[PDB]
Design a protein around this ligand. Structure first.
Ligand SMILES: CCCCCCCCCCCCCCCCCC(=O)OC[C@H](COP(=O)([O-])OCC(O)COP(=O)([O-])OC[C@@H](COC(=O)CCCCCCCCCCCCCCCCC)OC(=O)CCCCCCCCCCCCCCCCC)OC(=O)CCCCCCCCCCCCCCCCC
Ligand SMILES: CCCCCCCCCCCCCCCCCC(=O)OC[C@H](COP(=O)([O-])OCC(O)COP(=O)([O-])OC[C@@H](COC(=O)CCCCCCCCCCCCCCCCC)OC(=O)CCCCCCCCCCCCCCCCC)OC(=O)CCCCCCCCCCCCCCCCC
Ligand SMILES: CCCCCCCCCCCCCCCCCC(=O)OC[C@H](COP(=O)([O-])OCC[N+](C)(C)C)OC(=O)CCCCCCCCCCCCCCCCC
Ligand SMILES: CCCCCCCCCCCCCCCCCC(=O)OC[C@H](COP(=O)([O-])OCC[N+](C)(C)C)OC(=O)CCCCCCCCCCCCCCCCC
Ligand SMILES: CCCCCCCCCCCCCCCCCC(=O)OC[C@H](COP(=O)(O)OCCN)OC(=O)CCCCCCCCCCCCCCCCC
Ligand SMILES: CCCCCCCCCCCCCCCCCC(=O)OC[C@H](COP(=O)(O)OCCN)OC(=O)CCCCCCCCCCCCCCCCC
Ligand SMILES: CCCCCCCCCCCCCCCCCC(=O)OC[C@H](COP(=O)(O)OCCN)OC(=O)CCCCCCCCCCCCCCCCC
Ligand SMILES: CCCCCCCCCCCCO[C@@H]1O[C@H](CO)[C@@H](O[C@H]2O[C@H](CO)[C@@H](O)[C@H](O)[C@H]2O)[C@H](O)[C@H]1O
Ligand SMILES: CCCCCCCCCCCCO[C@@H]1O[C@H](CO)[C@@H](O[C@H]2O[C@H](CO)[C@@H](O)[C@H](O)[C@H]2O)[C@H](O)[C@H]1O
Ligand code: SF4
Ligand code: SF4
Ligand code: SF4
Lengths: 176, 318, 115, 145, 206, 70, 94, 155
């Protein structure tokens, strides 16, 4: 089915013709448009009072990255490199070796946050919930070098944000 | 004591202009479902001060290809002439009482156009030139109709003196016997002030910034102050012409309050109109005035010559 | 005097604002900064090249019409004449000939811009 | 009259903030003089408010502390001062404030939140976390040749 | 100001997307389609997903197909708000942009709630969608959809019968039905000239 | 809310009220408490110039009444 | 929602609509930001028997293209002519 | 005291410049859509004194909102040079920050800071409208820290 957006014939009875003459001379349809903007003047504005108020977000929000731990404090990451393999941007760089206790752990874990596209594939790929995108989006920096995260930065992010990250994962892990 | 009176005219003009910029941004904002400046000072009251200081400590640029003297002259003319427009205004007493105040205002409005033409030409850049030549077309569009609209109204006042319009409208606003002319006058002032939907010589979405695209910092501010001063002055002129305030010689401040309220609301209407409509095409502006207003203005001019004579109500010469 | 004093004060105030604007701020002038603006790419051809005027005929008509209002602006004074029969006839005569000239230019397509 | 009731609410805001001095402090710090229900306060002094009659997005807000981590934040406030436990509630990722549903405690979680440290001596500086890969031969310290 | 010739020079945003895709797996290449027409993110994902599902010879499940249509039409609303309001903003009518971008902001919330991203969701994938709708989302889409037609009415009150708007758009850029087909036009650029064509009707998907 | 636009309007209104009030009051101060004399036509200027001589203090606005005719 | 009665009347009149029935600002009709956990269904291949992958393997049913002609009676069209669209009965003319 | 005066004068000019930041109407790709959402009613950047102006001569900030390609690089540098000073550059999004998804392309500049100096880097792809607003407020607090007159006094 289709419809015509603009295929109508104006009527030619004297009343309709005068109605259009009054429209042309008295600007009635322009006055009508002024009414709409006037109504908006007296509507409450939609503006929120940032930074004292914040736009709403959901548990799935993809923000700044963080490396997580088990409740014992051991790192979850076991250097499988799945996140590195899937990263569409090649933003992840990893090196690994047996730890002094034999554990399979990384010695390098970098995320170039200026390469990253904040797609969340890395956290989908991680089999142990080690790498996540946290809820923080307020981490703009004054220098480029400050956005080249190494393992120490990412672990500090996890320790900094774990309280929120764990609750966000609790809310959404049953959709995953 | 006259020098003091001059300063008590132009210092307030510039302060009113600065806070008209804040008012416009708030009025547009709320009409756009937002707030507008409300952080710099309470309710944004210091925002005009911040912008003014910002611009005058910004680096001013003289373009490599520009004609230096004319580049500097044009903004000086713009603001100088804008302030000159205010001296014959009766609020209720003019600073300068002129026999032909209306004719003086017409002449000074024509001279102010050259601050657009010369700034655009002196910039020696294509967008600036295009903006200036749009000002030529705009002036050609409205100037003839604007003068004849005034003439038809003055056939009821009887003189070219601005203060006589107060006497003329002591019983009734001239908006009643001449609302068709008020309609056409009001539109002509939007074109005269380069205001939306006739903001063509700047035409941001088309010409980036048009005639003033090469201007920065203080020289640019002069053009902004000029335009906003003319917007207020032309609505005071509209209030005097068509919404005459009664004048009590012993309480002249009652006139000033009533007249100031009327002029403010007319200025708010300019912002309201900017919020509501799309922009004209500058050839469509020329056809609006010449093919619609001018035939009607000529007819109404004939009518307002005959009407006083046929009703035996010709006004006094004095 | 009052008039000349008022004009001098206005244009002196404007001049002082320009003097402050140029001498107060810190400047850093180099070639690229002062180059002509054209949306990021260098201009092609001088801005002094001829710019065709498509409303040239309306512009000439404006000159003739702009002199008509000089002839009409005295009408408020002319209405004080005792010889109102002649004055009203000549006032209407002048305005009609202005309307006839407008109608001629309109019907002859003088008000359409050259394409 | 309603126009009178409106003026009464405006004056209640001056008392609701503890007087003209308190009313002016919030007007100049936050450009907002609304009064809300105190949902809670965090260990840095940030106070959290709600008013569910306000529209979604304006129904929760924080008045930042005036001093955090040795920094004077009376005029300098930024969104990175909200700690993670309140971050979830303030952004409406959850309905429950940390007062009612406190986060799970871990011994490795930061006890002291830190705001954005860019531009300061505490800023992060990147470096390679791996040890040198090739070991160079060190010549003997004795002469013998 | 007569236009004697238009010579559009493009490539100022050419980023070798098509060469880059040759170095990605099919999953890794999906987010590149969010960033093509970056106002219609999920519609671009869907086109790529249908292509891969066709070469795979697999079919997405019915619920994913319904979610794809649902968010395809939410995306169409996103696109048309941007198309109309920025078009009006260029012609000088700046106020519809602000009224309608508040609606766009609320639709960005739907994107973020299903995917975690307001714009580049990477949500539609070959095989279906990445995650199921969070509980309570369809209620909120209904609340938004309930009020939206009134917002379109306000937009039409500002423009549709405005004489200034009509003067700027009526008989401007007329293209004939024959030229549009031969020049490779599609979508509204065909239907504006009377051609009765819409792939959702003639070559339906999902 | 829209009434938060009012403060800027009031400031604009006060500034625009000043020139009219100032001109009116400076005229009274400079013309012995009265309105400034308006002389659009030569006759009005003639009388004003005559008042300057009649005043005896070279001010056209110092009036002389019956007390000046013996 | 907090507008006074006169202001509601004024903006209702100016716009010609009843704006209070469809406010563009969200209040309490929106969902709670905390929800009960989901329990999502499984797919048709979640079975313990009669579920051999080789009977549900779409990729292995894809075939190389059929060669119709290579270089190693009535006229036809690619498909039947398209049926003419019918006018909408919801609202044929805008 | 000279120091007290220049300290207060620094506060005035710093306050005026950060309170009245006019970005150039300059956008490149997807990130410009979030920049549009900062001007939209929810965030209303105008309420901080942040107003877009088309002309570089009347702009104080360049927000590089999107991928910078090699073909575009000379134009971006041109309009940056044509901004009067003081001027600031905000790098928005991974593309502008360092190439992002197109870092390895033959046609993309690996970070706009190869072309212009950058004051603030806003991460994300795209950064949310609120994240960009956080970056602008960060720029304001940087301007507030400037010590031009204090350093001039001690020259
Ligand atoms: C209040 C007045 C506002 C205007 C102020 C003008 C001076 C501004 C300072 C300035 O010119 O910039 C530096 C400018 C030098 O800068 P530059 O880039 O090195 O050289 C500029 C060009 O060489 C020369 O610059 P140019 O390309 O613009 O041409 C020079 C000049 C042409 O100058 C001349 O050739 C003769 C002098 C012209 C002025 C005399 C009036 C011309 C005849 C009309 C009669 C009017 C009588 C009044 O051009 C003019 O037409 C001057 C118009 C002045 C109009 C005054 C209003 C009346 O002037 C100097 O200070 C020297
Ligand atoms: C020169 C002009 C300026 C001088 C006039 C000064 C007049 C005093 C203005 C005071 C307004 C403060 C209202 C108030 O108490 O705040 C309530 C507010 C608490 O109320 P709320 O809980 O948020 O709810 C607000 C209403 O429910 C939701 O708001 P609403 O939309 O329902 O409005 C409520 C109320 C608010 O309006 C007023 O109370 C003031 C009316 C002044 C009308 C002047 C025009 O208006 C009415 O009730 C209706 C009568 C108002 C006249 C409406 C006629 C409009 C013109 C007709 C349309 C055509 C125009 C073309 O308290 C505050 O936030 C205080 C903020 C202070 C704002 C600045 C006030 C000073 C303004 C400048 C003073 C002079 C400098
Ligand atoms: C000509 C003189 C013009 C006087 C302008 C005075 C500026 C007032 C002001 O600074 O606002 C308060 C401001 C407000 O502080 P703020 O700018 O840091 O506020 C940040 C934004 N809020 C509050 C919403 C979080 O105080 C100052 O910043 C100190 C600047 C003092 C300027 C010194 C003048 C001498
Ligand atoms: C409606 C009109 C509105 C007008 C608004 C007027 C602005 C009011 C606020 C004024 C604040 C004080 C001015 C400071 C801004 C100066 C610009 C700047 O940042 O320079 C940084 C420069 C920094 O210089 P620097 O030495 O540190 O380094 C620059 C050199 N390189 C590039 C190598 C590093 O400061 C100065 O050079 C001098 C500062 C002096 C401050 C006192 C100003 C005295 C004013 C007299 C100037 C002489 C000309 C006469 C002008 C008319 C006098 C009023
Ligand atoms: C006793 C005998 C009496 C004899 C005398 C009788 C005289 C009265 C009867 C004569 C008719 C009265 C009306 C005359 C007013 C002028 C009318 C007019 O000129 O409008 C026509 C004009 C063109 O419209 P358009 O459709 O584009 O083209 C027509 C076809 N060619 O349309 C336009 O102008 C469009 C303008 C667009 C820009 C508008 C932007 C502002 C709109 C809001 C302004 C509201 C008006 C407020 C006025 C305030 C006054 C202080
Ligand atoms: C290209 C660059 C241009 C840059 C712009 C520079 C500024 C120029 C501004 C415009 C200059 C033209 C000024 C013309 C003033 C005319 C105003 C007027 O007519 O009234 C002034 C007054 C006559 O008063 P009136 O009421 O008519 O009769 C006397 C009744 N008592 O008569 C007086 O008050 C006496 C005035 C005599 C001196 C006039 C000098 C004008 C010369 C031009 C400067
Ligand atoms: C429909 C939308 C159109 C949009 C176009 C813009 C139009 C806006 C026009 C604004 C001006 C309208 C008039 C404002 C009324 C101001 C009222 C006032 O302050 O003065 C009181 C006045 C009576 O006083 P007065 O004028 O002295 O009496 C006349 C005798 N000469 O008043 C008597 O009650
Ligand atoms: C292209 C060419 C167009 C030419 C058009 C010319 C149109 C002229 C129309 C006639 C205009 C004047 O019309 C004429 O005016 C005079 C006075 O003004 C009127 O005269 C009337 O008033 C005057 C005084 O005011 C009395 O002296 C007279 O007794 C009385 O009849 C005439 O009754 C009227 O017929
Ligand atoms: C005494 C003063 C008052 C009397 C009016 C005086 C002005 C008269 C104006 C011209 C009247 C006749 O001349 C004019 O001819 C042209 C023919 O090209 C017509 O113009 C025609 O094309 C133009 C442009 O599309 C449009 O105005 C209109 O669509 C159409 O009518 C005008 O409708 C007609 O008005
Ligand atoms: S979010 Fe995407 S681009 Fe960023 S590190 Fe993870 S997989 Fe790579
Ligand atoms: S996918 Fe997880 S466990 Fe594997 S390397 Fe990445 S962060 Fe470590
Ligand atoms: S950083 Fe991301 S959102 Fe921004 S332009 Fe690049 S791909 Fe688009």
């Amino acid at each position: 089915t289709y419809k015509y957006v603009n295929l109508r014939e104006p009527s030619m009875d004297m009343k309709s013709v005068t109605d259009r003459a009054a429209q042309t001379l008295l600007w009635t349809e322009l006055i009508r448009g002024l009414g709409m903007t006037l109504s908006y003047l007296f509507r409450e504005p939609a503006t929120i009072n940032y930074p004292f108020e914040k736009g709403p977000l959901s548990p799935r929000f993809r923000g700044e990255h963080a490396l997580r731990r088990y409740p014992s404090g051991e790192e979850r990451c076991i250097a499988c490199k799945l996140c590195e393999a899937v990263c569409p941007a090649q933003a992840i760089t990893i090196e690994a070796e047996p730890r002094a206790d034999g554990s399979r752990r990384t010695t390098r874990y970098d995320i170039d946050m200026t390469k990253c596209i904040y797609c969340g594939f890395c956290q989908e790929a991680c089999p142990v919930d080690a790498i996540v995108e946290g809820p923080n989006f307020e981490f703009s920096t004054e220098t480029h070098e400050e956005l080249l995260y190494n393992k120490e930065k990412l672990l500090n992010n996890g320790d900094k944000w774990e309280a929120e990250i764990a609750a966000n994962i609790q809310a959404d892990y049953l959709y995953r | 004591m006259f020098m003091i009176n001059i300063l008590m005219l132009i210092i307030p003009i510039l302060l009113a202009v600065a806070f008209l910029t804040l008012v416009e941004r708030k009025v547009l904002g709320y009409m756009q479902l937002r707030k507008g400046p409300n952080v710099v000072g309470p309710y944004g009251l210091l925002q005009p001060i911040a912008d003014a200081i910002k611009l005058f400590i910004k680096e001013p640029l003289r373009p490599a290809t520009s004609s230096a003297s004319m580049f500097i002259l044009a903004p000086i003319m713009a603001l100088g002439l804008a302030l000159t427009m205010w001296i014959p205004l009766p609020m209720p007493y003019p600073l300068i009482n002129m026999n032909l105040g209306v004719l003086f205002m017409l002449a000074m409005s024509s001279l102010a156009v050259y601050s657009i033409l010369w700034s655009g030409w002196a910039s020696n850049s294509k967008y600036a030139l295009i903006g200036a030549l749009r000002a030529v077309a705009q002036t050609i569009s409205y100037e003839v109709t604007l003068a004849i609209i005034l003439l038809s109204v003055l056939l009821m006042s009887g003189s070219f003196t601005l203060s006589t319009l107060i006497t003329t409208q002591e019983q009734m606003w001239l908006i009643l016997p001449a609302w068709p002319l008020a309609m056409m006058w009001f539109i002509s002032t939007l074109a005269e002030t380069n205001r939306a939907p006739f903001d063509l010589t700047e035409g941001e979405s088309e010409l980036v910034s048009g005639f003033n695209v090469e201007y920065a910092a203080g020289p640019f501010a002069l053009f902004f102050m000029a335009e906003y001063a003319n917007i207020i002055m032309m609505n005071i002129f509209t209030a005097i012409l068509f919404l005459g305030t009664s004048h009590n010689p012993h309480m002249p401040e009652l006139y000033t309050i009533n007249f100031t309220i009327k002029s403010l609301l007319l200025t708010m209407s300019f912002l309201w109109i900017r919020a509501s409509y799309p922009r004209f095409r500058y050839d469509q502006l020329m056809h609006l005035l010449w093919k619609n207003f001018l035939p009607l203005t000529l007819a109404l001019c004939m009518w307002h010559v005959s009407l006083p004579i046929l009703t035996s109500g010709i006004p006094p010469q004095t | 005097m009052n008039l000349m004093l008022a004009l001098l004060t206005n244009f002196t105030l404007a001049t002082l604002l320009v003097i402050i604007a140029f001498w107060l701020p810190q400047l850093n002038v180099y070639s690229e900064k002062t180059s002509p603006y054209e949306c990021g790419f260098d201009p092609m051809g001088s801005a002094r090249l001829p710019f065709s005027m498509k409303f040239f005929l309306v512009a000439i008509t404006f000159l003739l019409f702009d002199l008509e209002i000089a002839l009409l602006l005295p009408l408020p004074w002319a209405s004080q004449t005792a010889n109102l029969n002649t004055m009203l006839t000549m006032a209407l005569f002048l305005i009609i000939l202005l309307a006839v000239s407008l109608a001629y230019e309109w019907t002859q397509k003088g008000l359409e811009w050259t394409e | 009259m309603e126009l009178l009731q409106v003026l009464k609410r405006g004056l209640q805001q001056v008392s609701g903030h503890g007087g003209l001095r308190g009313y002016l402090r919030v007007l100049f710090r936050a450009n907002d003089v609304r009064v809300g229900t105190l949902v809670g306060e965090d260990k840095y002094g940030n106070k959290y408010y709600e008013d569910n009659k306000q529209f979604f997005g304006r129904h929760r807000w924080v008045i930042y502390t005036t001093e955090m981590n040795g920094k004077n934040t009376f005029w300098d406030v930024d969104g990175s001062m909200v700690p993670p436990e309140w971050h979830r509630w303030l952004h409406c990722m959850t309905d429950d404030p940390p007062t009612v549903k406190p986060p799970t405690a871990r011994k490795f979680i930061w006890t002291n939140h830190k705001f954005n440290l860019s531009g300061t001596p505490q800023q992060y500086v990147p470096y390679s976390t791996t040890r040198k890969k090739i070991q160079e031969w060190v010549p003997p310290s004795t002469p013998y040749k | 100001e007569m236009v004697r010739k238009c010579d559009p020079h493009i490539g100022l945003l050419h980023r070798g997307t098509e060469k880059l895709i040759e170095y990605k797996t099919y999953l890794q290449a999906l987010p590149y389609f969010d960033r093509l027409d970056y106002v219609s993110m999920m519609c671009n994902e869907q086109a790529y997903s249908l292509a891969v599902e066709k070469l795979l010879n697999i079919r997405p499940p019915p619920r994913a197909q319904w979610i794809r249509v649902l968010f395809g039409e939410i995306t169409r609303l996103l696109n048309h708000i941007m198309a109309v309001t920025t078009h009006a903003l260029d012609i000088g009518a700046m106020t519809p942009f602000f009224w309608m971008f508040e609606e766009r902001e609320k639709m960005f919330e739907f994107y973020e709630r299903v995917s975690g991203a307001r714009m580049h969701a990477a949500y539609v994938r070959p095989g279906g969608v990445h995650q199921d709708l969070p509980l309570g989302l369809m209620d909120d889409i209904y609340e938004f959809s309930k009020n939206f037609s009134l917002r379109i009415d306000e937009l039409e009150e500002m423009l549709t019968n405005n004489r200034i708007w009509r003067n700027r758009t009526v008989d401007i850029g007329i293209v004939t039905a024959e030229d549009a087909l031969n020049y490779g036009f599609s979508g509204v650029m065909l239907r504006g000239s009377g051609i009765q064509w819409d792939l959702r009707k003639t070559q339906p998907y999902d | 809310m829209w009434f938060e636009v009012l403060p800027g309007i009031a400031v604009m209104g006060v500034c625009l009220f000043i020139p009219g009030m100032a001109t009116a009051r400076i005229h009274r101060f400079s013309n012995g408490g009265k309105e400034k004399r308006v002389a659009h036509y030569p006759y009005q200027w003639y009388l004003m110039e005559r008042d300057r001589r009649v005043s005896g203090v070279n001010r056209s606005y110092v009036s002389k009444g019956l007390e000046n005719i013996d | 929602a907090s507008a006074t009665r006169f202001i509601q009347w004024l903006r209702n009149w100016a716009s010609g609509r009843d704006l209070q029935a469809k406010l563009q600002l969200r209040y309490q009709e929106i969902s709670k930001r905390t929800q009960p956990p989901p329990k999502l269904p499984v797919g048709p291949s979640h079975k313990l028997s009669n579920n051999y992958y080789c009977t549900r393997d779409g990729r292995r049913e894809a075939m190389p293209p059929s060669i119709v002609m290579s270089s190693q009676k009535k006229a036809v069209s690619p498909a039947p002519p398209i049926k003419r669209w019918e006018l909408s009965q919801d609202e044929p003319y805008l | 005291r000279g120091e007290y005066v220049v300290a207060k004068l620094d506060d005035l000019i710093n306050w005026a410049r950060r309170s009245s930041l006019w970005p150039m109407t300059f956008g490149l790709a997807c990130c410009a859509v979030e920049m549009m959402h900062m001007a939209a009613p929810r965030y209303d950047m105008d309420r901080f004194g942040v107003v877009f102006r088309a002309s570089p001569r009347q702009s104080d900030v360049m927000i590089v909102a999107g991928t910078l390609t090699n073909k575009m690089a000379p134009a971006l540098r041109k309009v940056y040079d044509q901004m009067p000073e003081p001027r600031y550059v905000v790098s928005m999004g991974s593309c502008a920050n360092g190439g992002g998804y197109y870092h390895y392309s033959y046609s993309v500049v690996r970070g706009c800071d190869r072309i212009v100096p950058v004051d603030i880097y806003v991460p994300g792809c795209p950064p949310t409208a609120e994240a960009l607003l956080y970056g602008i407020l960060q720029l304001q607090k940087k301007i507030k820290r400037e010590k031009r007159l204090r350093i001039w006094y001690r020259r």
